[PDB]
Design an enzyme around this catalytic site. Structure first.
Site: not given
Length: 279
Positions: A225, A70
């Site tokens: 994100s 991520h």
């Protein structure tokens, strides 16, 4: 102004007023001299596409490296050679989330003040950015930490949240002083999961975004994100091209943004889409 042919959609979108381009247009300064801190699961600074401009320097979780991907993906959208906005910016990884993707409030806060102090000792002549692609329920502590970071002279871009609701109940998204980022898809529709509301300051590509991944690979995922690093990279780009201040950067990005082109933006929420003014 140069043109990266066949670039990933997010980059094409922020460099053009209208959909349709297959290239990413940007000034060669490419954010050189600016610094962007990624507060996430860490950044695999060994990924070839960073050209050694990325460094994983601090961890508050169980491990010291990004074992999830991520954080590396966000770092990639910020400044990887192939998938990044500011291709010559320096990137710093601050790991506050474990490889599962979760972290304590105390460690997230500690990651923020760490950026506030560390950036002071780094050579970042154009300015410093903090990219926070994380967002749980409302937290005064998280908001205060983000506010402190912003006030200290760092432009803070934070994810609006993926609950498809007003971001007022998400932190650090709900902090007034930071730059809260919503997400959109390649056909100019708000991402199905993107939060909204008055607290959101800008929208950027967040659905199906391709970038660096762990193992030296790449990945295509969605979320606020993913939109956040587009804004973090854009600010680094602007710092290195026209300058600006950490306190006026969010407003600057709003002023430059492409207006009224997004679908599913409720009244009361800004219909602003990131634009770099390259065309």
């Amino acid at each position: 102004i140069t043109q990266q042919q066949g670039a990933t959609w997010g980059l094409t979108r922020i460099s053009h007023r209208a959909r349709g381009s297959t290239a990413y247009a940007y000034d060669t300064s490419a954010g050189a001299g600016a610094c962007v801190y990624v507060i996430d699961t860490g950044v695999e600074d060994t990924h070839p596409d960073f050209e050694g401009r990325a460094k994983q320097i601090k961890s508050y979780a169980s491990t010291a490296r990004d074992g999830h991907g991520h954080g590396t993906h966000c770092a990639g959208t910020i400044g990887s050679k192939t998938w990044g906005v500011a291709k010559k910016v320096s990137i710093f990884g601050v790991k506050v989330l474990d490889d599962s993707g979760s972290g304590s409030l105390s460690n997230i806060i500690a990651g923020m003040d760490f950026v506030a102090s560390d950036r002071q000792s780094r050579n970042c002549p154009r300015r410093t950015v903090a990219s926070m692609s994380l967002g749980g329920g409302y937290s005064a502590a998280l908001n205060q930490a983000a506010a402190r970071l912003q006030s200290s002279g760092v432009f803070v871009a934070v994810a609006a949240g993926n609950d498809n609701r007003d971001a007022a109940n998400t932190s650090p998204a709900s902090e007034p002083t930071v730059c809260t980022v919503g997400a959109t898809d390649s056909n100019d529709v708000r991402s199905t999961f993107s939060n909204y509301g008055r607290v959101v300051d800008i929208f950027a590509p967040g659905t199906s975004i391709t970038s660096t991944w762990i193992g030296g690979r790449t990945n295509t995922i969605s979320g606020t994100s993913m939109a956040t690093p587009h804004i973090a990279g854009l600010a680094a780009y602007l710092f290195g091209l026209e300058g600006g201040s950490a306190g006026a950067m969010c407003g600057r990005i709003q002023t430059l943004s492409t207006k009224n082109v997004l679908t599913s933006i409720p009244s009361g929420t800004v219909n602003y889409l990131a634009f770099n003014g390259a065309t």
